[PDB]
C-alpha cells in the first residue's frame, strides 16, 4: 500500500 | 472447480488480511516468511486444482491473484488480453515488484478494454508513483490522477477507497499547484467523505496517515497526533506512523520547552538584544510603501507581540530577536522564537524554504502582516499551549533590515512511493 511524504524543495 | 479456485483465493486474501489479527507483532517480524509459506501451500493445492482446468484464463488469473507470478499471469493474460481484473492484479504485482511503468501499462490496457473502478483507482495511484524528469510532466501526471480518481468516484460514490485516492490526489494538487487552501480543504473533505460512507475506510491505516500528514503541514497537531496514533493502532508492526508520532511529540516537547525557557538565553544578553532593536531593521516596512497581497500601499503600524489578535493582523508589523531556532528531520517548517520585550516568546513557522536557509540567534527579524495561531494540544497525557506566527514563504521576512532574494524560496514537494 502506498505511502506519502512531503519534503522541502531543492531549487 | 473454478468455484473451488475462487474459494482458495478468497481464503488466501483473508489470510493476508487476518495476519495481523491471528499473529500480530509477536509474529509479524516473520510477516513475509509466513505469508510466502502460506502462498506456497496455496500455490501447491492451487496447482493440483488448476491441473484439471489448465486451459481457462479465469483459472490462471485466479492463480495469479493468489500470487498477488509475473510470467504465469503474463502467459495467462497473453492467452486472454480482454481480462481486466487480471490486468489489475498484474499491475498490482509489478507495483509490489517496483515496476511502476509496467503497472501503468497494465492499468492503461485495462481501461482501454473496459472502464472500471479498480483500474481507475490504481492508475490514479500509479501515475503519481511514476518517475518523472520534468515538473510539467509531474503536474500533468498529478492532474491525470485527479481525473482517474474523479471517474472512479463517478462510477462509485460509495467507495471510501476511491475517496482516499481523491484525498491523495488533491493533496498532490495542493503541493504542486501553488498551495491553494481550497484544494487542501477538498482533500480533507474527501477523507471525511470516505470516513462517512465506508466503514472499511476507517480500518485503512493509510488514510489516517495521509490525513494526519496534511494536518501536520497545516499545523493541526492534535488531530494529526490522533491520526498517527490511530494508524499506529491499525498497523503496529509497520513502525513509520509510530516514528512520525514520536518525532512530532519530541518536536512539540523541544518547542514548548524552548518557548517557555526563551532558548536558555541569559537575561543580560536578552536585554542587550532587545536594546539593539532599531526601527531601521523594519527595512521596506518603515517608509509606508509596503505592498500587501491585494496590491495596496498600506501604512503599517509597529504592533507588540502581546497585543496581537488571532488571525491575520491587518496593517500590523512585528519586530523581534531570534533566541532559538529549530528544524526537524523532515525540515519543511523552520521554527524560531522571537521576543520583542520582556514578555512571552512567540514561535515563527517558515514554510517553502531552501535546505540551507535559516536565521541566527540575535538576528533582528521583522514580519509584516502576522498570521497568529493559538496551539492547544492534548495527546496521551502530554499538554502543549503556545502561540505560533505562521508565514508561508521566506519572501515575507525582513531579517536585519534586508529582504531575501528568490534564492531563499523553494516550494515543498510531495513524494508518493511504494
Amino acid at each position: 500500500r502506498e505511502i506519502v511524504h512531503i519534503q522541502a524543495g531543492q531549487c | 472447480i473454478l468455484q473451488k479456485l475462487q474459494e482458495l483465493v478468497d481464503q488466501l486474501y483473508s489470510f493476508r488480511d487476518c495476519y495481523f489479527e491471528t499473529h500480530s507483532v509477536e509474529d509479524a517480524g516473520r510477516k513475509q516468511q509466513d505469508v510466502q509459506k502460506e502462498m506456497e501451500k496455496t500455490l501447491q493445492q492451487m496447482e493440483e486444482v488448476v491441473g484439471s482446468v489448465q486451459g481457462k484464463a479465469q483459472v490462471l488469473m485466479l492463480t495469479g491473484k493468489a500470487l498477488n507470478a509475473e510470467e504465469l499471469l503474463s502467459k495467462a493474460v497473453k492467452l486472454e488480453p480482454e481480462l481486466v481484473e487480471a490486468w489489475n492484479q498484474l499491475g498490482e504485482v509489478y507495483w509490489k515488484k517496483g515496476d511502476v511503468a509496467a503497472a501503468h501499462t497494465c492499468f492503461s490496457g485495462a481501461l482501454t478494454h473496459c472502464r472500471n473502478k479498480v483500474s481507475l483507482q490504481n492508475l490514479s495511484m500509479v501515475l503519481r508513483q511514476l518517475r518523472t524528469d520534468t515538473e510539467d510532466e509531474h503536474s500533468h501526471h498529478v492532474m491525470d490522477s485527479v481525473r482517474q480518481a474523479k471517474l472512479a468516484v463517478q462510477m462509485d460514490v460509495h467507495d471510501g477507497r476511491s475517496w482516499y485516492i481523491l484525498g491523495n490526489s488533491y493533496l498532490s494538487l495542493y503541493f504542486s499547484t501553488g498551495q491553494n487552501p481550497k484544494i487542501s480543504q477538498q482533500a480533507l473533505s474527501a477523507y471525511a467523505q470516505a470516513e462517512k460512507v465506508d466503514r472499511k475506510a476507517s480500518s485503512n491505516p493509510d488514510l489516517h496517515l495521509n490525513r494526519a500528514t496534511l494536518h501536520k503541514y497545516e499545523e493541526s497537531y492534535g488531530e494529526a497526533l490522533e491520526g498517527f496514533s490511530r494508524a499506529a493502532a491499525l498497523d503496529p508492526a509497520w513502525p513509520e506512523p509510530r516514528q512520525r508520532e514520536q518525532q512530532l511529540l519530541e518536536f512539540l516537547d523541544r518547542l514548548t520547552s524552548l518557548l517557555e525557557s526563551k532558548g536558555k538565553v541569559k537575561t543580560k544578553k536578552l536585554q542587550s538584544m532587545l536594546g539593539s532593536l532599531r526601527p531601521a531593521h523594519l527595512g521596506p516596512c518603515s517608509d509606508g510603501h509596503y505592498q500587501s497581497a491585494s496590491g495596496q500601499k498600506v501604512t503599517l503600524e509597529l504592533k507588540p507581540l502581546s497585543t496581537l489578535q488571532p488571525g491575520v493582523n491587518s496593517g500590523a508589523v512585528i519586530l523581534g530577536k531570534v533566541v532559538f531556532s529549530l528544524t526537524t528531520e523532515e525540515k519543511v517548517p523552520f521554527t524560531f522564537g522571537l521576543v520583542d520585550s520582556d514578555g512571552p516568546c512567540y514561535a515563527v513557522m517558515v514554510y517553502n524554504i531552501v535546505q540551507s536557509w535559516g536565521v541566527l540567534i540575535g538576528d533582528s527579524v521583522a514580519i509584516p502582516e502576522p498570521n497568529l495561531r493559538l496551539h492547544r494540544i492534548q495527546h496521551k497525557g502530554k499538554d502543549y499551549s503556545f502561540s505560533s506566527v505562521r508565514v508561508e514563504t521566506p519572501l515575507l521576512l525582513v531579517v536585519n533590515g534586508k529582504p531575501q532574494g528568490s534564492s531563499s524560496q523553494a516550494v515543498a514537494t510531495v513524494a508518493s512511493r511504494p
Binding site: - | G263, K264, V265, F324, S325, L326, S356, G358, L360, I361
Partner: protein
Amino acid sequence: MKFNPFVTSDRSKNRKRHFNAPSHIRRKIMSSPLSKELRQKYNVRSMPIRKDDEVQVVRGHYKGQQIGKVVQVYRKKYVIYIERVQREKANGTTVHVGIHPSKVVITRLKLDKDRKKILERKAKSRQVGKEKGK
C-alpha cells in the same frame, strides 16, 4: 604524570607535531564530544567529526540552542564549516565562519558502515576498562 621515556613533554615538539600533522592524524585531532543523549546510547564520549553530522555550538559568538549540519571539514586550518554560521562580507557575499570541533557538540551522527564499527570499538574498549576496574 607521564612516565614513558619515548613520549615527549617538549612544548615546541608537541606544537610542531600538532601543526605539521598529516591529514589522517588531523582527523583524530579534530574530534568533537557527543551530546548527553547519544553518550548514554552509544557509551561513547567523543567521535571524529564528519561532513554530514548535525552539531551544536557551545562557545563563542554563535553559541545557542541552534543545530546545524556541517558544510565541510576543512582540516588544513583545523576547523569546520557549519550550515548557518556565516558572515556577510562588505559586498554582501556570505562566507562560512569557522568553528573549532572542540567547541561544538554533536547532536546527530551520520551512520556509515565504518562509523558503526568505530562506536562499537570504543564501546568494547570502554567496557574492558570498566571490567578491569571492577
